[PDB]
């Protein structure tokens, strides 16, 4: 680890600076270094980790989609053969994406998940595990595709089970998990009815619990609820 010589606190400070500077690759490396110190992460620190890698892989996913579209077009009838370059470069970006996913999954497996005992931390990491297996599923075309999908599903399902037992229906992590698992159903598992059902039930149960919240918690919860509504609007 290139970050092995840097203090945990300095890695966290620098991750924050990197976020301010919109340097998400640096942010992700700092946060990897912090995780590898071996201590559990606070809430703020888990958020830094997630934001960093979400931004890095988000950029790779967007790039992969642009390239995959160009590649598809090149493989339609009446398209002029332009050699292996589009496939090669889509593969390059794909491999880099896969590497990032593998890195995040490796952090989760060694050893964030196993040390996470509180519902809020355990659900957050299991949601991440689901997300990064979903990103691997997005680009999978091989022998392992079904197993990758199932890995995403299993991680999301464990998170869902804990969240429903341990968190209120308005809890932002419970909402965010549901939002993402619902997307997994729609986009990855070919289960749009499950996606819709989950988004709707999650929204409605949250609605009914808003009355219990402070103004600030209300703001947090309603923000993610609107994302559930946005997807339902997209899908219905």
């Amino acid at each position: 680890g290139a970050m092995g010589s840097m203090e945990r606190a300095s890695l966290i400070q620098k991750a924050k600076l990197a976020e301010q500077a919109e340097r998400y690759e640096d942010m992700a490396a700092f946060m990897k270094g912090a995780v590898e110190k071996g201590e559990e992460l606070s809430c703020e620190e888990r958020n830094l980790l997630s934001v960093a890698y979400k931004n890095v892989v988000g950029g790779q996913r967007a790039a992969w989609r642009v390239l995959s579209s160009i590649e598809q077009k090149s493989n339609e009838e009446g398209s002029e053969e332009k050699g292996p370059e589009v496939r090669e470069y889509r593969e390059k970006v794909e491999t880099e994406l896969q590497g990032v996913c593998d890195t995040v999954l490796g952090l989760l497996d060694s050893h964030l998940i196993k040390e996470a005992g509180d519902a809020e931390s355990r659900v957050f990491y299991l949601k991440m595990k689901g997300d990064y297996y979903r990103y691997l599923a997005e680009v999978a075309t091989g022998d392992d595709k079904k197993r990758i999908i199932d890995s995403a599903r299993s991680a999301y399902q464990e998170a869902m089970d804990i969240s429903k037992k341990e968190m209120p229906p308005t809890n932002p992590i419970r909402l965010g998990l549901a939002l993402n698992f619902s997307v997994f159903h729609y986009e990855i598992a070919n289960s749009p009815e499950e996606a819709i059902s989950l988004a709707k039930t999650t929204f409605d149960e949250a609605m009914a619990d808003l009355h219990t919240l402070s103004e600030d918690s209300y703001k947090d919860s309603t923000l993610i609820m609107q994302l559930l509504r946005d997807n339902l609007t997209l899908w219905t």
């Binding site: 997300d131 965010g176 939002l179 993402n180 997307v183 729609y186 986009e187 993610i224 994302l227 946005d230 997807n231 997209l234 899908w235």
Partner: peptide
């Protein structure tokens, strides 16, 4: 694409 967080 749909919203995720």
């Amino acid at each position: 694409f749909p919203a995720t967080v």
